Amino acid sequence: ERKLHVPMVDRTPEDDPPPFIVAVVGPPGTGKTTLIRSLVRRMTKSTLN
């Protein structure tokens, strides 16, 4: 039963989909920027100052 849902249409293209938008939202001073730099380094091995 829990598999059932309202049928809908997904318009994501089959080929070459756009990048997923990841928004780092939070109060000031929580560490949004330092999170992005750490994440970017892991995937690309280069630090964005």
Binding site: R11, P18, P19, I21
Partner: protein, 49 residues
């Protein structure tokens, strides 16, 4: 990225107050955007163009 295509000569002859022509670059998302010009779009915090 954001780019202003206004010819600087128009900026000086008429002044900074003149309306500008701008080019916006980015990935498209959601349903396909029609190719023909004249499509109405709303830029959040600016207005409808």
């Amino acid at each position: 990225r954001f780019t202003d295509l206004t010819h600087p000569e128009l900026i000086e002859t008429q002044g900074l107050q003149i309306d500008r022509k701008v080019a916006i670059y980015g990935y498209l998302h959601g349903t396909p955007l029609p190719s023909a010009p004249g499509t109405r779009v709303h830029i959040a915090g600016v207005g409808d163009f």
